[model samples]
Target: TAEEERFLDAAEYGNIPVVRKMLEESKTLNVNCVDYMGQNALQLAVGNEHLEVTELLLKKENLARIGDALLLAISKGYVRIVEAILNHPGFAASKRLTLSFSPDITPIILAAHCQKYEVVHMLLMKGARIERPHDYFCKCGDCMEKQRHDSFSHSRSRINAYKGLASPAYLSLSSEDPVLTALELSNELAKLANIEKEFKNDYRKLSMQCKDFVVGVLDLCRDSEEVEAILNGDLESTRYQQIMKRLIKRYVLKAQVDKENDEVNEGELKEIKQDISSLRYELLEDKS
Candidate 1:
């Protein structure tokens, strides 16, 4: 009860001086100190908006302890605490203490989930990995599919209407009119016409290609609708949407993985050849 009372006092009041003095005197700073409801000191500080107290508590040497502190700060909307924790040594690079709490997440994923852009950026700069499983189903469902499909159909109809128009014979003669020529309107029209023509010529092929790629990825990952929802358009969750947007860059890097590897030497190649020969002999003759 004494320890519980001390914890309550520390959390309810910004009891920085007492906590700091206790810590400096070599008293064990209870890393797992939680309130009656299981919320840690960091969570308590953040919930009470005790920014200064939160910062002071985080100044202790244990980084894993501070990772929880940082996460709690972010979750509770303590922007200053989030910034301070991120700037702390190893915070950005630290393996998340609660990663197992959310299996589909990395630190970047959590930052994105919480819409903490600075935290997300910090983790990315510190080399946090964002894994996009092509086959992994999105938790958001098939919302993206219906929206994109409807928009694509509407866009197709507009393209067809434009293509059905006859060439403008009078536009050439009307070029002399001040209103018509005011902004090189005819030239703009011609440029637009060219663009429209290209779209018309490529629409079917482009649509088919996009459709196939989306379907193939979905099939491969078995979660096409969810992935498409995140990648196709404006995300329902802006943080998640931004994360998905940033994921494209990681995908580009992944694409270059093989090319980025160092070339093997002849010595290494010889070892590989020997292994292959040994395997072949074993299969062919049951050699030991």
Candidate 2:
């Protein structure tokens, strides 16, 4: 009993020699012992950024509270600590990527929520995924089972999953063309905002977050080609093309006026050129 507390303390304090000695010498040491704070040695070592101590703890046969330790490491953005915890046999040998601190909030979700790109990528490479929730009307056996188990929790976890799905980090890293992905996702979320009365605010908030993510993605566009591609893809409607054409003409007129006055601004001109090229691409698609 006394050895357990000392071991936890040593782990918490990052006392490497003491932790190693306890692991090696003790005949009956509880490597999973929790302190008065209820955090086990592994969690403490992780929270304290003691990578060496964490590796030592993982060597134990049955270390407990590993998911909790991972959640802590991820939430705190302790990159190296998160990596160490992820490499443990407990996770490597299991489907712990989906092992959540709660019924929801899987490891990737937490990393995405925190906007820790590196950690999110790490989790993804390890085969973590945020499963899209089923439609509200679907009566699949798994859905019915969860609904019967706890309807309220089922709704809560569904909302939690959407939040993760809509996060900017998740959208960027998980999609081929995140701009289109976010646009469709934002629209879907906006519709959901009106469909679910109890969670209207949450869905509405997530809808706007996806919209913001699209804007952010556009801001990161590298060249006129990427910008033109986005504009061309979204201008499938005749009415949309007409509206964009009108806007492009207005900008062209301004550019002509600025050029005559010898006050040409490259920034404004570049955008106008992009808009004109995007409209041409849209028109070209119509003919073929």
Candidate 3:
């Protein structure tokens, strides 16, 4: 009991030295020692943005709470803390982190909710799953709209205004977002198969065009989700924030089949290409 209090207070107060010293002195003290709602010391440190304290506490046992730390760090947009948790001697965060914060959220979903661009991209590039399959949207997308639409000021002129239209056939490609990479590639492959025979050897160029078309649509949507979300939520922004030292591992392991070809150019493209695939899934899921 005494060991637990000392360790918990030291962690809650962000004292890295006491936390380490206390843990070594008391086997009873651990990462799961929770007094703050359903979260543990690491969650407390992360929620408070205490990077050192969070990092110090991460080395212990009780991994069940890592999800709490991740979700807390993500929801608060603390990229540093989020990274600390993921980097704490664990497996790659790749493959959509099947662990959800709830039935409606995942680590990346919380990151997306905070509009923390860095957080979402790290998880995506690492191969975080965007959905459960046979299922599309996640709650982060709904929060995105609710967080901004009410204050957007030009509601009617937004989605329906004078937005440029695609060919009626392309528009009819799917009742939902036909731009999904799965659906997009499906359609493109079908068309590439026929295509007047003149465009025959153009499959690669055609694929790139299809990918860029979706990118353009997103860029355009980001253009008008207003300065609010885009300014904060653009995961593709390329701004510098850091995490998961094993990105290359994520690339190799994410594509799994590409492991032997890991360093090859096409393998790299395949990993990055999944980024587009997931986004399209989100667009169809987000619906707004």
lDDT per model vs. reference: 0.42, 0.60, 0.44
Instruction: List model 1 lDDT by residue over 1-288, tens digit each.
Output: 565567556555445454555556555545455554443554444333344444455556553455555555555445555666566453334443454121323444445444334445555555553323121112235456445655455344444322211111111112132212212322333444455554644444333333443333234331233535334332311764444334433433433463357585564454355445434433554432
Model 2 RMSD to the real structure?
18.2
Best by lDDT: 2
Q: Where's the lowest-lDDT run of ten residues in candidate 3? A: 159-168
Candidate 3 has which clashing residue pairs, if any? 95-127, 95-129, 96-128, 96-129
Candidate 2 structure lDDT: 0.60
Query: Each prediction's TM-score against the native?
Result: 0.37, 0.69, 0.42
Q: What residue runs in model 3 are displaced by over 4 Å at the alpha carbon?
A: 26-28, 36-39, 46-58, 92-103, 132-288
Rank candidates, TM-score, best first: 2, 3, 1
Ranking of predictions according to lDDT: 2, 3, 1
- What does candidate 3's lDDT look like per residue over 102-175, in tens digits? 43344544453343445655665565534332111124344655555565333322211111111112322222
Clashing pairs in 2: none
Give the C-alpha miss distance for residue 229 in model 2, angstroms: 8.2
User: Model 2, 1-288: lDDT tens per residue?
Assistant: 888767665554445555557667854765556445454643453333354545565566655566776777777667777777777544544333443334456677777676656687787777656555566544545665665576577677777778778755654365344456677777778777767678789888887787665554445433333456567645631655454344434433543464467765564554355445435534554565
Off by over 4 Å in 2: 37-39, 46-48, 54-58, 90-103, 138-143, 225-288
